[PDB]
C-alpha cells in the first residue's frame, strides 16, 4: 500500500536552497529519518510539557518551548523566529 514520507518536501526545500543540486536515494532516506526523529522529539517534549502543566492540549506555545528546550542556541532562536512567522502568517491568512 501507500507508504508516506517527506521525500517530495525535502526535494522542494533542496530546490529552494540549491536550484542546481540534486539528492540521492540514501540521502533522501537520511533526511526522512532526520525529519521523523526531530518530529518525534519535539512532539514528545510538547506532550511532556502538557502533562506536566496538567494541560490536555498541544499548542504553538508548547511547540515553541519544546523547540527552545531541544535545539541549541542559534538553531533554537531561528526556529522560534520561523515558527512565529508561520503562525502569524496563518492567523493573518
Amino acid at each position: 500500500t501507500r507508504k508516506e514520507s517527506y521525500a517530495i518536501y525535502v526535494y522542494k526545500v533542496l530546490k529552494q536552497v540549491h536550484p542546481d543540486t540534486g539528492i540521492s536515494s540514501k540521502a533522501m532516506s537520511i533526511m526522512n529519518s532526520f525529519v521523523n526523529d526531530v518530529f518525534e522529539r519535539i512532539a514528545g517534549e510538547a506532550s511532556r510539557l502538557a502533562h506536566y502543566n496538567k494541560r490536555s492540549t498541544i499548542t504553538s506555545r508548547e511547540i515553541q518551548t519544546a523547540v527552545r528546550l531541544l535545539l541549541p542556541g542559534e538553531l533554537a532562536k531561528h526556529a522560534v523566529s520561523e515558527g512565529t512567522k508561520a503562525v502569524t502568517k496563518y492567523t493573518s491568512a
Partner: protein
C-alpha cells in the same frame, strides 16, 4: 469553496496537514491545537533547509552535484550546533572527519 492548502496558507513547503494528522494519531495528547502543526512544520522546514544548505556547500566543495550521506555527515559534524543536536545520531555511509592528532604527525 476554492480549496487552499494549509502549507501554502502559512507559506511553508512542509505538509502542515500531514503533521496535524501525525499529531492526532501520534498519541501525544488528547487534543492538538491549530497553530501547533504549523509551528512544528516551520521548525522542520528550517532544520531541513539548514541541513541541505550545508550539505550542498560541502558537495560544491567536492565538485559534485548530488548530495550523498558523506556530504550530509560532513555538514552535520562541521556545524557545531547541528553536531550537538545529532550527537547520538549515526548516519549510514557517512564516514568520519579527516583529522589526525598532532602528536601522531612528525615535525
Amino acid at each position: 469553496a476554492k480549496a487552499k492548502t494549509r502549507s501554502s496558507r502559512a507559506g511553508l513547503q512542509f505538509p502542515v496537514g500531514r503533521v496535524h494528522r501525525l499529531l492526532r494519531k501520534g498519541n501525544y495528547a488528547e487534543r492538538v491545537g491549530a497553530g501547533a502543526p504549523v509551528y512544528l512544520a516551520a521548525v522542520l522546514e528550517y532544520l531541513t533547509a539548514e541541513i541541505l544548505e550545508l550539505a550542498g556547500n560541502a558537495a560544491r566543495d567536492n565538485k559534485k552535484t548530488r548530495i550523498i550521506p558523506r556530504h550530509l555527515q560532513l555538514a552535520v559534524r562541521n556545524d557545531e550546533e547541528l553536531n550537538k543536536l545529532l550527537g547520538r545520531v549515526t548516519i549510514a555511509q557517512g564516514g568520519v572527519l579527516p583529522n589526525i592528532q598532532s602528536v601522531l604527525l612528525p615535525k
